[PDB]
């Protein structure tokens, strides 16, 4: 239900705020794992993901997160380059079966990530990494880079269904 309405409020949204809400999910998610890269917690990060196909605790843990952020995602909606415009064509334009199991699935992968960051107690290094990002053009452009990857990922998750 939280996630069935979710897609109802982001496929059923204006253009524009569904397209800037979708965007800010995918810079946090391009933040996260270049913070989790920068910090070199990748394999940590992957046998704490891991456990979430064995974990009960974690389940409930993750299922309640992703929740909060369909919360804070619908909240947005209401307050009012070319890979990202070419992913919302993409995401908008997609068998709608397979556009909600790829949403659903970089919703997940979010609640991981700030799970893990929380669970890691990296809360404040992950706010001072983004507090150094502004003066960083360098870093700047490895998130640029990122997002593109994950769009590319996501388009070929698409193109697999």
Sequence with gaps: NPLDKWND???HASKKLSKKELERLLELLALLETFIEKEDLEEKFE???????IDEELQQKIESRK?????????????????????????FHASKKLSKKE???LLELLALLETFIEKEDLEEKFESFAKA?????????K???????????????ILSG
């Design 133 to 141: 990002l502004r003066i960083d053009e360098e870093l700047q452009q």
């Design 103 to 105: 949403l659903e699935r």
């Design 47 to 53: 046998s704490f993901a891991k456990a979430l196909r």
């Design 67 to 91: 929740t909060d952020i369909v919360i804070q995602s619908m909240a947005n909606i209401l307050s009012g380059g070319n890979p990202l415009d070419k992913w919302n064509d993409i995401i």
């Design 143 to 157: 998130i640029e880079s990122r997002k593109t990857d994950i769009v590319i990922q996501s388009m070929a998750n």
């Design 9 to 11: 409020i982001i496929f």
